[PDB]
Amino acid sequence: MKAGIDEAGKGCVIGPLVVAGVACSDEDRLRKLGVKDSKKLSQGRREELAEEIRKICRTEVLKVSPENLDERMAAKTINEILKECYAEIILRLKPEIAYVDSPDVIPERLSRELEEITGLRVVAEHKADEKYPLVAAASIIAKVEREREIERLKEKFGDFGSGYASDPRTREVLKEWIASGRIPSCVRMRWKTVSNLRQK
């Protein structure tokens, strides 16, 4: 079987990093589910599609908490962390060939390092989620898992917006949490955004 790998939450300041892999024995059946045009789907429809994917394909998920990300980012960058997560998923699935979505503009270097770590055939590409049904499926699984955690967090800490530095609601909420001296555990402390706000 072939497999697709992707992530959700790499650029967020709140919440986990989720990496997922999907391997199917029947791609045309996967296509029938309509993974190709899943970007238009709502959070509710995405969740439903993820359940259908899980029933006909093997899936593997990995989640890295904000706390654990902060720990690992002391010695590595977010992209290197991703690379490590990608390798773990590929090794669990051990596919014939694995298609991955590339964070940087130059894929070749990622393919090399991955094929070396895994010893398997790997093809990292240009925003591969919209080229290979397998990767798009991986994207759906990762996004749904991330979303469930985000919802759980809002239930506990209130509505902090999307969790991205761009969302105005997120910046505001982050500002007051910092000023309170009591910051929730779901905030990535080693993030550039947080440092700059604490230095303010």
Swiss-Prot record:
Changing residue 129 to N: Lowers activity by 50%. Residues 1-200 form the RNase H type-2 domain. A divalent metal cation binds at residues 6-7, 101. It comes from the Archaea. Its EC number is 3.1.26.4. Substrate binds at residues 46, 143, 146, 164. Changing residue 146 to A: Decrease of activity. Increases Km for RNA 26-fold. CDD domains: RNase_HII_archaea_like. GO terms for biological process: DNA replication, removal of RNA primer; mismatch repair. Manganese or magnesium. Binds 1 divalent metal ion per monomer in the absence of substrate. May bind a second metal ion after substrate binding. The keyword Ubl conjugation does not apply. InterPro entries: RNase_H2_suA, RNase_HII/HIII, RNase_HII/HIII_dom, RNase_HII_arc, RNase_HII_hlx-loop-hlx_cap_dom, RNaseH-like_sf, RNaseH_sf. It catalyses: Endonucleolytic cleavage to 5'-phosphomonoester. GO terms for cellular component: cytoplasm; ribonuclease H2 complex. The keyword DNA-binding does not apply. GO terms for molecular function: manganese ion binding; RNA binding; RNA-DNA hybrid ribonuclease activity. It is found in: Cytoplasm. Its cofactor is Mn(2+); Mg(2+). Keywords: Cytoplasm, Endonuclease, Hydrolase, Magnesium, Manganese, Metal-binding, Nuclease. Belongs to the RNase HII family. Endonuclease that specifically degrades the RNA of RNA-DNA hybrids. This is Ribonuclease HII. It comes from Archaeoglobus fulgidus (strain ATCC 49558 / DSM 4304 / JCM 9628 / NBRC 100126 / VC-16). The lineage of its organism: Archaea, Methanobacteriati, Methanobacteriota, Archaeoglobi, Archaeoglobales. The gene is rnhB.
